C-alpha cells in the first residue's frame, strides 16, 4: 500500500516526493519516484566529505585552509567564526556535514579539484562509486537554484541512496575514514524534523540534510533497527509548483519516514 500512502502525502503537502529504500536480505526495495531527478541541495556535502576523506590521508584533515569573509557567499554558520583565521580540512568537513555550512563545501570542492574543477571532481568521485546519474555543476549557492526540470545539480533518491549504502555500509571508505564520516553525519545538527522525527527513538538515525529553492527539502540517512540491522533511506522533495521561494515542508519528510519505518518494524 506504500504507494498510496505516498501520493496522499504528495496530495496533502502539494509536493513531489521521491523515496528509495535499498533492499535488504529481509525486505524488498521501497521505491517511489526513485529514479526521477531531485536537486542535491546540501546532501552533496556528505559524499563530498567522503571524496575528500578518500583521496587524501588523514594527515590532510589537519591542513589549515585559509579563506576570506568575501568567501562566505552562502549560509555558513561555522565558517562565519574564522573570517581570516581559516580552518583545518577536518574542521570544514565537520562544518559541511553537521552544520550544512556552504562556504565549507566550496573550499572542499576547491580542495578536491582546483578552483574550476571541484564540481566535476566531486561528480567523478560519484562515478567511481557507480553513480553514472548524479551530477554536480555549480558551487554554493547556485546549486540550490537550478530551475525545476533541469538536470544540473541533480541526483536521484535511488542513486544517492546507493552512494550512501556504499559509503556507510559498503567499502567505499576504509574503516577509519568510514568511521569519521559516520560520526559526522550521526551528529548532524540539521535533521531533527526530517527522517529522525519519522523513526522510533530506539532506532539509530544518521543523516545529512538538503534544502533549497522551489520548496526543495531533502534528507539522506542510514538507519539502524533495535536489532541493529541497517537501512539506507533517501527522502527528497520539492514543491516547485509554488515558485522559487515556496516553503519546504519538513514534516513531509518526517511523514515519509514514518511510513518506511512502518514496513521496517
Ligand atoms: C541558496 O541557498 N539556499 C538555501 C541553502 O543554502 N540550502 C542549504 C541546505 O540544504 N541547508 C540546510 C540543510 O542542510 O537542510 C539548512 C537547514 S534549514 C534551517 N535550519 C536551521 O537550524 C535554521 O535556523 N534555519 N534554517 C533555514 C540551512 S540552509 C542550507 C536554502 C535553504 S531553504 C531555501 N529555499 N534555500
CATH numbers and ranges of domains, the chain:
1-265 (3.40.710.10)
Question: Is there a contact between 237 and 216 (Cβ–Cβ < 8 Å)?
Answer: yes
CA atoms within 13 A on the CB side of 178: 12
Burial of 70 (0-12, 13-18, 19+ CB in 10 A): exposed
Determine the distance separating the centroid of ligand 1 and the alpha carbon of 193, expressed in angstroms: 13
Question: Who contacts 224 (Cβ-Cβ below 8 Å, separation ≥6)?
Answer: 203, 204, 205, 230, 231
Q: Pick the catalytic residue from 42, 74, 76, 237.
A: 42
Alpha-carbon Rg for the chain, nearest whole angstrom, is 17
Question: Is there a contact between 156 and 175 (Cβ–Cβ < 8 Å)?
Answer: no
> Using the 8-state DSSP alphabet, how is residue 167 labeled?
I
Give 3-8 contacts, CB < 8 A, sequence gap 24+.
3/32, 5/259, 6/32, 6/256, 6/259
Sign of CA dihedral 188, 189, 190, 196: positive
Q: Is 31 an active-site residue?
A: no
Determine the distance separating the centroid of ligand 1 and the alpha carbon of 211, expressed in angstroms: 5
Determine the distance separating the centroid of ligand 1 and the alpha carbon of 118, expressed in angstroms: 22
> Using the 8-state DSSP alphabet, how is residue 194 labeled?
I
SS3 content of the chain, % helix, strand, coil (to 5): 45, 15, 35
Residues 60, 20: Cα–Cα separation, whole Å: 34
Q: Which grid coordinates are listed for 177? A: 575514514
Q: Is 8 an active-site residue?
A: no
The closest alpha carbon to 148, from 255, 258, 262, 16, belongs to 16
Q: Is 144 a pocket residue for ligand 1 (Cβ < 6 Å)?
A: yes
Q: Which grid coordinates are listed for 205? A: 538515525
Q: Which grid coordinates are listed for 248? A: 519546504
Nearest residue (CA) to ligand 1, atom 5: 212
**What's the reported resolution, in angstroms, to a tenth?**
1.9
CA–centroid distance for 144 within its chain: 13
Determination technique for this PDB entry?
Answer: X-ray
Q: Pick the catalytic residue from 31, 74, 134, 140.
A: 140
Question: Is there a contact between 185 and 232 (Cβ–Cβ < 8 Å)?
Answer: no
Residues 236, 234: Cα–Cα separation, whole Å: 6
Determine the distance separating the centroid of ligand 1 and the alpha carbon of 216, expressed in angstroms: 10
Q: Is 212 a pocket residue for ligand 1 (Cβ < 6 Å)?
A: yes
Strand partners of residue 209: 219
Q: Is 103 a pocket residue for ligand 1 (Cβ < 6 Å)?
A: no
Q: State the Cα angle at 139 between 136 and 141, rounded to 5°.
A: 120
Q: Is 43 a pocket residue for ligand 1 (Cβ < 6 Å)?
A: no
Question: Who contacts 101 (Cβ-Cβ below 8 Å, separation ≥6)?
Answer: 75, 76, 77, 78, 79, 92, 95
Q: Which grid coordinates are listed for 108? A: 572542499
Residues 12, 5: Cα–Cα separation, whole Å: 11
Strand partners of residue 233: 221
Residues 23, 31: Cα–Cα separation, whole Å: 10
Q: Is 163 a pocket residue for ligand 1 (Cβ < 6 Å)?
A: no
Residues 4, 110: Cα–Cα separation, whole Å: 43
By DSSP bridging, strand 38-39 and strand 154-155 are antiparallel
Residues 61, 131: Cα–Cα separation, whole Å: 26
Q: Which grid coordinates are listed for 217? A: 527539502
Q: For residue 4, how many other CB atoms are within 10 A of its CB?
A: 8
Amino acid at each position: 500500500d506504500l504507494a498510496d500512502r505516498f501520493a496522499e502525502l504528495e496530495r496533502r503537502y502539494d509536493a513531489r516526493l521521491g523515496v528509495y529504500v535499498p533492499a535488504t536480505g529481509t525486505t524488498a526495495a521501497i521505491e517511489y519516484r526513485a529514479d526521477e531527478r531531485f536537486a542535491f541541495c546540501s546532501t552533496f556535502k556528505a559524499p563530498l566529505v567522503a571524496a575528500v576523506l578518500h583521496q587524501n590521508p588523514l594527515t590532510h584533515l589537519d591542513k589549515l585552509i585559509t579563506y576570506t569573509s568575501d568567501d562566505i557567499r552562502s549560509i555558513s554558520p561555522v565558517a562565519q567564526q574564522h573570517v581570516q583565521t581559516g580552518m583545518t580540512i577536518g574542521q570544514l568537513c565537520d562544518a559541511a556535514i553537521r552544520y550544512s555550512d556552504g562556504t565549507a563545501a566550496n573550499l572542499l570542492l576547491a580542495d578536491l579539484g582546483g578552483p574550476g574543477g571541484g564540481t566535476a571532481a566531486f561528480t567523478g568521485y560519484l562515478r567511481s562509486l557507480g553513480d553514472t546519474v548524479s551530477r554536480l555543476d555549480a558551487e554554493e549557492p547556485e546549486l540550490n537554484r537550478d530551475p525545476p526540470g533541469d538536470e544540473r545539480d541533480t541526483t536521484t533518491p535511488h542513486a544517492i541512496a546507493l552512494v550512501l549504502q556504499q559509503l556507510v555500509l559498503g567499502n567505499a571508505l576504509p574503516p577509519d575514514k568510514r568511521a569519521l564520516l559516520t560520526d559526522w553525519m550521526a551528529r548532524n545538527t540539521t535533521g531533527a524534523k526530517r527522517i529522525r522525527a519519522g523513526f522510533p527513538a530506539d532506532w539509530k538515525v544518521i543523516d545529512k540534510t538538503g534544502t533549497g529553492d522551489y520548496g526543495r527539502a531533502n534528507d539522506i540517512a542510514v538507519v539502524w533497527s533495535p536489532t541493529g540491522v541497517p537501512y539506507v533511506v533517501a527522502v527528497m522533495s520539492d514543491r516547485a509548483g509554488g515558485g522559487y521561494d515556496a516553503e519546504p515542508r519538513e514534516a513531509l519528510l518526517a511523514e515519509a519516514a514514518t511510513c518506511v519505518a512502518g514496513v521496517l518494524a
